[PDB]
Design a protein around this ligand. Structure first.
Ligand SMILES: Nc1nc2c(ncn2[C@@H]2O[C@H](COP(=O)(O)OP(=O)(O)O)[C@@H](O)[C@H]2O)c(=O)[nH]1
Ligand SMILES: NC(=O)[C@H](NNC(=O)c1c[nH]c2ccccc12)c1ccccc1
Length: 169
């Protein structure tokens, strides 16, 4: 049983916790503490491989930067989820990608761009914009919704494969 350590990083309010809890508790949480940083584990036999997923629902700000940067190094795959109805979170993608790349000191870092809230209206971030960015980074992008669980299943699976892809280069 192989263990995969992945961290869901992004802006606050994008739905980091809900997206993960949906695949852990099998239901959508309407109200959940945004400052909670818990780690959930899930075992799935994906691609004929029985692996154990180690995920961490980031809050946003830790007591010390070194503590936040700690799991930034141990993270093999990072799920970059943003809100299509919040352009502010989409622009922050540049900072995260650049920052985490520096922390690990690598240009080839397994990441998947995720556009949450695809089931909600008032979309300011067009799909093309997100896709354009993902194609420039050299990573995949899929729209998702924690409420309908659309794309979320694929996104999480893709991240694991991206990790494997990086470890089989
Ligand atoms: N309608 C809708 N709300 C979502 C979605 N994902 C998360 N939310 C809501 O966003 C708010 C914060 O969710 P939370 O799990 O704390 O995400 P986080 O704080 O960004 O890690 C809550 O009201 C969630 O129910 C979604 O996909 N669709
Ligand atoms: N945030 C935490 O619980 C940190 N430990 N856990 C982790 O790093 C991991 C938990 N889930 C992960 C997913 C991918 C990589 C790492 C982890 C932590 C932070 C500060 C001090 C001591 C421990």
């Amino acid at each position: 049983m192989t263990e995969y350590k992945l961290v869901v990083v992004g802006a606050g309010g994008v739905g980091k916790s809900a997206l993960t809890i949906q695949l852990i508790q099998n239901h959508f949480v309407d109200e959940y503490d945004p400052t909670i940083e818990d780690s959930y584990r899930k075992q799935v036999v994906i691609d004929g491989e029985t692996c154990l997923l180690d995920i961490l629902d980031t809050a946003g700000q830790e007591e010390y930067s070194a503590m936040r940067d700690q799991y930034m190094r141990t993270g093999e795959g990072f799920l970059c989820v943003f809100a299509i109805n919040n352009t502010k979170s989409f622009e922050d993608i540049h900072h995260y990608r650049e920052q985490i790349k520096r922390v690990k000191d690598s240009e080839d870092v397994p990441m998947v761009l995720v556009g949450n809230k695809c089931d909600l209206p008032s979309r300011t971030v067009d799909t093309k914009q997100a896709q354009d960015l993902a194609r420039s980074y050299g990573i995949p992008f899929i729209e998702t919704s924690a409420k309908t669980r659309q794309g979320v299943d694929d996104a999480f699976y893709t991240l694991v494969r991206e990790i494997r892809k990086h470890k089989e280069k």
